[PDB]
Design a protein around this ligand. Structure first.
Ligand SMILES: *[C@@H]1O[C@H](CO)[C@@H](O)[C@H](O)[C@H]1NC(C)=O
Ligand SMILES: *[C@@H]1O[C@H](CO)[C@@H](O)[C@H](O)[C@H]1NC(C)=O
Ligand SMILES: *[C@@H]1O[C@H](CO)[C@@H](O)[C@H](O)[C@H]1NC(C)=O
Lengths: 157, 321, 321, 157, 321, 157
């Protein structure tokens, strides 16, 4: 993916985070678990919903075949009529298929972008305190108490 | 002690396509194509379609005697006709400007049939004898119900001079025809006079038909031909016939009542006893998908037709293996 | 001591749309749709459009006497006609292949009218008496200026045999007609002979018209009908008339001079005393926007028409609140 | 935004930089102010101008309705004529609206991309000398004299 | 000691365009437009096109005597006709519904010509004398080969009553015509009777042609006119002629054999002695490019036509200077 | 470029890497040279091949002009026929030209994205051991023996 996070330096997703799309896994003496990052998750949900509706919307102006009949000695206008009706269907089929293809790829990149951004937001807080392990995880210099709530908080140090 | 950034996986099996990669597995997806119909012809919004069975629009409008089903039809939503309906034009010929009329029917939801020239209005000509083997009814020879096959009375076909004024407020579809016999002896046998004509007049119409004699193949056991013409008589306008034979004369015409958007769909299918909000020639549609791929010709609140086999939008992210 | 990377905000209020978000506020934006016209009909590039007022192309070309404004018109840019012009075809009938002629007019910028068969060229027939109540001029009964209503002279309509050769270098629009009376006594009253015809010949044309008798509704107080035909007579080609009555004969024809791209637009509007480089049926356009949304039918250097209400491109960045 | 800078880790724009689209704010003993980064600003201006012209250009090949009339008994070809003229207008309306929508989003992302790149270009110079505050700003270890001109310069250390 | 991340440059000179930047130089590129043809007309898949030289489809089908090349043609792939072929309709007139016939020819790959009414089948009329200066052959006056110009025998044109039944399994293109003389004395000179007709009948056809007299310009030294009609006679169907003069009668008709997709292309070009898998009016195409820009009208396995001058996809990255 | 690597903080490409699209240059006591990163190169090759084929594929449903003739008194349907055939060609010409333009730009960005990702993957390994020079290169604290094979390896420290 363009942003390098999803299936990138973060090797795979988490079955254990049923909570939202992106978040944290913490692990310390008191235990361990997953918590979703509410803000980025919600931003993501709106982004995608709006996209979908925008996609649906732009697609309702579209060619509508009307049936027309022609006698045996109007073979040219009947053929004209046919190639016109098919042409607009090929143009709109092409439109919808491409839009889907392109926007799908922007959707997967957007999630990748959201993960990297969330990661960086945490990199920018722990800057010398923890060791950037290289796998999406930071390993603390000083033991962190459920201190974790504070990394997730935006308020750490 | 360690904190990690990460993302959702689940057990999703759904795949979507991108420009650079096919069948990417995603946590979540939104299929936007309707692929399913019910394979029936249904009422549209409660309103029943006119289903012609084995009758053509022509068979219906002229009143082929085998088209008795459609002698008096209620308001319809849309019309269904087969590819090759059997009961059309039982007495062979043509229907002038048929397709243009069919086109007009597509902006029409209800016809009310009314008598403009009563059959028992003909003093000087025979009106009970205009029948044929090509249009049988209950075994016996019969003719299109809506038009009168006028014949000479005791060996004389005097000139006909008849007028009808549209007192109605609704446009009137008026239908008439002419007969083309095979030889001169047929011309004499039915009408007596050797050369004839039919002139039709209205505000806009300036017609004069003349019989075309030719020997031709028996279509339906007849070598004669009926050729049917039509007009839309405006309100407060008068139609004027004058003819000395070959004239097939209107008995009934159709008031155009409650014209609304509608279409003639072609389908071998028969009525399905259902209701729908969107109908296609192959079946009806019930869906909230913005697209369907069923058939291009729909009527109603319909999703947009595309030729795709698959349209699925990614919503979640790439699901890890 | 601190150094910071950052970006522009301003007090911009301009919003643009994206696939994922609507009304994003931007520092800078470029609106590319022209939404404004002047609501007038204007000269196009200095060149004035032919504005028919209450005349139809037919009213103009045949020279309806109420269409005197357009007896001799200069070169035009485009033509304007109303939806339902009143002064058309004052003597009722039809204009054969009218639409195809209108189509030809769309590739024509100037007609020069010239006399091909002089009115005082008719020895054996009456030419001053071909008038009607349907085409009044200054109170008195009058007829289309460009064609001559020929009548019998002292009870005889001898065969007419007239030819015109195109010595001009320009294609010639030649216009003629035929009269269809209501009964046999009208046929006799004007032309005497019971059955007539008009034959028209040229290199390519092989015509024979025959009067169609019918009783019909009075349109404009007349039950008779004029039916007008036309041809484009090539250069060095001869048109050949022959007729024993009902013939409406050309007095004037139109040289096609300076044909250039042009169109007939439909508009209830009247001339605006302005100049423009791009004109629409609702008004003229002055803009450098690549698109406009005014009306699809334009003529001139025009932006492209779209059905949008809004097309605004982001150029700056997202303006912070 | 995909690049995380604009309305991201850099919370908002600057009314005080009327100078160009991206640049620096510096603040030290001798005072403080804004200076625009000329190079990235100019790169950005060309990118967008070219885009706009490309957008305008591709759009001049387009359907042009021609008026055509049909008598009372040509209702089918008149309807054919109508559905054809409308169809091409719906296809081009859809084209222009979508292109605008998609390219607008690439325009906002491009600015976001330019800010991040400019930020990184400065991160890569101050690497241990200043503390990466997390908000678009770097706080110096050693006091910097109007030294600032040198960060903006590309020539620092 | 130092390790560096980096990327490919090469000595590539290839440029591609983007929305934001033109002529970006790339390491690798894939041009997808075919710009080259061979400028010849070639056989299509081994199968040779029917090249009419100076003959029109009309010149061919009626058998203009200057179109002897195409008296009996093998199966073709596609047909080529010039913009203005000289050898068309040597005796002037019209070909009724010509374009609709040409349209039918586009779904036809082989005609087999067969005699339906033998020339030496006419007892009561002269059949060797139906020739003209407008259709010369080897210096002497001659006529369209496929149709017979029937003339009176010793001053009498008795009524003709001829029928042909389609025993073949293939649809039959049947061609006939009518002659329109300039005056009454021409009518008498060739056919004797003053008023004539031709009636044509079949299952579906109900025709009656009547001569149109007019004086007209000499096209090809003749003022008379031939007007040619046609029908597709279904299998097991009978065509019925009846006429007392002006009748141009079929000698030969065409069996429709092996109809397959094909087209008539317009081209001044002549046969090229080549083979191809895709042909255009300007030349043939040999390419694996998904697009070409040669001409819109192709036939065969063809790339898609676009109006571009350039379509090049980036595959490598931006090549450094 | 959106990712800042290609013609960005990495000033230009390498004539000396004929090997693949992205990789490494190493330089130490034992010498120096170029080696291509096989994995990212191969990922890139598939991405682009698939793209090209997708592009070709979506483009085969397209309008096909059929020749039709009209007599002298059918000038309106002939003009209808013409404007219809041209309209579909303008719509498909516009389609292909735009798709090319947009996808070209995604292709160049994708390579830029692949270089940055590969760079980051190396930044994440050498994190305090080498000095991030700012030009695509890392300069080691401790001399690295042909140790290099190990950076390229994914297995270093
Ligand atoms: C045509 O001839 C065939 C062969 O005898 C016959 O079977 C068929 O019925 C004929 N059709 C007509 C209309 O004469
Ligand atoms: C038709 O009849 C109505 C009803 O009397 C009358 O008002 C109208 O004028 C008539 N029109 C014609 C043309 O006779
Ligand atoms: C028409 O008149 C011109 C001028 O004399 C002459 O040259 C030309 O041949 C004529 N054409 C016909 C068909 O009479």
């Amino acid at each position: 993916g363009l942003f390098g996070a999803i299936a990138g330096f973060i090797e795979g997703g988490w079955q254990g985070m049923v909570d939202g799309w992106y978040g944290y896994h913490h692990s310390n003496e008191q235990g361990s678990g997953y918590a979703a990052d509410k803000e980025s998750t919600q931003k993501a949900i709106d982004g995608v919903t709006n996209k979908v509706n925008s996609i649906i919307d732009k697609m309702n102006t579209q060619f509508e075949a009307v049936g027309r009949e022609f006698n045996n000695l109007e073979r040219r206008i009947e053929n004209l009529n046919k190639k016109m009706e098919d042409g607009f269907l090929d143009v709109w089929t092409y439109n919808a298929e491409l839009l889907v293809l392109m926007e799908n790829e922007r959707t997967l990149d957007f999630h990748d972008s959201n993960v990297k951004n969330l990661y960086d937001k945490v990199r920018l807080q722990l800057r010398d305190n923890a060791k950037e392990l290289g796998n999406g995880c930071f390993e603390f210099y000083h033991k962190c108490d459920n201190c974790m709530e504070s990394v997730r908080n935006g308020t750490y140090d | 002690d360690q904190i990690c950034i990460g993302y959702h996986a689940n057990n999703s099996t759904e795949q979507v396509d991108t420009i650079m990669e096919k069948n990417v597995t995603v946590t979540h997806a939104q299929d936007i194509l309707e692929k399913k119909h019910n394979g029936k012809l249904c009422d549209l919004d409660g309103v029943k379609p006119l289903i012609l069975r084995d009758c053509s629009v022509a068979g219906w409008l002229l009143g082929n005697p085998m088209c008795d089903e459609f002698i008096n039809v209620p308001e319809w939503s849309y019309i269904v006709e087969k590819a090759n309906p059997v009961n059309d034009l039982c007495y062979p010929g043509d229907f002038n400007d048929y397709e243009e009329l069919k086109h007009l029917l597509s902006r029409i939801n209800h016809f009310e049939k009314i008598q403009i020239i009563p059959k028992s209005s003909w003093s000087s000509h025979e009106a009970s004898l205009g029948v044929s083997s090509a249009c049988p009814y209950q075994g016996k020879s019969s003719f299109f119900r809506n038009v009168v096959w006028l014949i000479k009375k005791n060996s004389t076909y005097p000139t006909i001079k008849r007028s009808y004024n549209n007192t109605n407020q609704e446009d009137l579809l008026v239908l008439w025809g002419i007969h083309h016999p095979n030889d001169a002896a047929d011309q004499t046998k039915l009408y007596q006079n050797p050369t004839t004509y039919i002139s039709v007049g209205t505000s806009t119409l300036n017609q004069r038909l003349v019989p075309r004699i030719a020997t031709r193949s028996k279509v339906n056991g007849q070598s004669g031909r009926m050729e049917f013409f039509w007009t839309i008589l405006k309100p407060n306008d008068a139609i004027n016939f004058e003819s000395n034979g070959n004239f097939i004369a209107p008995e009934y015409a159709y008031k155009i009542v409650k014209k609304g958007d509608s279409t003639i769909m072609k389908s071998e299918l028969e009525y399905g006893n259902c209701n729908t909000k969107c109908q296609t020639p192959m079946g009806a549609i019930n869906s909230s998908m913005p697209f369907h791929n069923i058939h291009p010709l729909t009527i109603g609140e319909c999703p947009k037709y595309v030729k795709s086999n698959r349209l699925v939008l990614a919503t979640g992210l790439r699901n890890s293996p």
